[PDB]
């Protein structure tokens, strides 16, 4: 008996103001280790479409530049069906996008997502969702976490070690107890560069609905969804929550109205 979602959708209106203050870590620029270039326009839209409280996530793809091989330019963000939670998220499988055009040689770089807490490392549910996706597929993927608090955003890329993939494999589901030897050291500090010269795009599901909080049981985590290039929808969009629009449809016919009440313009 509560209608608490309304305040978050109002708060989401001012998410463009958080993009004024953008922060990057950048500890020590190691030449031998890899570096990842994130387009600013992807960060702009991904923060705008996301929720203020509930966590939102998506895959990322890209490829190397002509100048350097280890400079990985992120070309595309790929939103997928998901059930968002506070500091946690049930993400779908690695989506097949080989059928779509202009996808030749898209290296699966990792995934990008929001976060409520600020940390120097990947959280419990963050490491578990990393290991659930990227254990069998590709161990050297990254995790761009975004700490989005009022009036600001802070980016931090991380790379999970082989010790983390064991711990993530062991501790699955919402919580197999509170902990079983959780550590800050599991995630290595990876490099991340925010460029505003290079541009990127969005790939979205064919139906357009990626947020299944109000959809409910329709969220199939194992399912194979269809995809397409497009402009992504915000968290509390018209299409993600059709239950509130179908409260009182009523089935009302036309009405005659009075002679004075009739529209002069027609």
């Amino acid at each position: 008996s509560k209608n608490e979602w309304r305040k978050s959708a109002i708060a989401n209106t001012l998410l463009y103001l958080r993009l004024k203050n953008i922060y990057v870590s950048a500890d020590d620029f190691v030449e031998e280790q890899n570096v990842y270039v994130l387009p600013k326009n992807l960060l702009k839209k991904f923060i705008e479409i996301s929720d203020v409280k509930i966590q939102v996530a998506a895959f990322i793809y890209g490829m190397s530049a002509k100048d350097h091989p280890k400079v990985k330019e992120i070309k595309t963000v790929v939103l997928v069906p998901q059930l968002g939670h506070v500091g946690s998220v049930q993400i779908s499988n690695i989506p097949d996008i080989g059928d779509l055009p202009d996808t030749e040689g898209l290296e699966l770089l990792g995934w990008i997502h929001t976060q409520t807490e600020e940390l120097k490392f990947m959280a419990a549910s963050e490491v578990a969702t990393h290991s659930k996706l990227f254990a069998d597929k590709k161990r050297d993927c990254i995790d761009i976490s975004i700490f989005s608090t009022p009036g600001s955003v802070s980016l931090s890329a991380y790379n999970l070690t082989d010790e983390g993939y064991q711990w993530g494999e062991e501790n699955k589901d919402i919580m197999n107890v509170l902990s079983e030897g959780f550590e800050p050291t599991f995630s290595t500090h990876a490099q991340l560069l925010l460029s505003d010269r290079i541009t990127g795009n969005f790939i979205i599901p064919s139906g357009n609905v990626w947020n299944y909080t109000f959809m409910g049981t329709a969220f199939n985590q194992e399912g194979d969804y269809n995809f397409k290039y497009g402009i992504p929808l915000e968290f509390y969009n018209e299409m993600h929550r059709p239950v509130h629009f179908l409260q009182f449809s009523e089935l009302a016919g036309d009405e005659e109205l009075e002679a004075e009440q009739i529209d002069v313009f027609s």
Binding site: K75, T76, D102, R197, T199, G200, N201, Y229, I231
Partner: peptide, 11 residues
């Protein structure tokens, strides 16, 4: 902006 480095696509 677009002349120097082109975007991947318009819509």
């Amino acid at each position: 902006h677009n002349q120097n480095n082109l975007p991947p696509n318009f819509f």
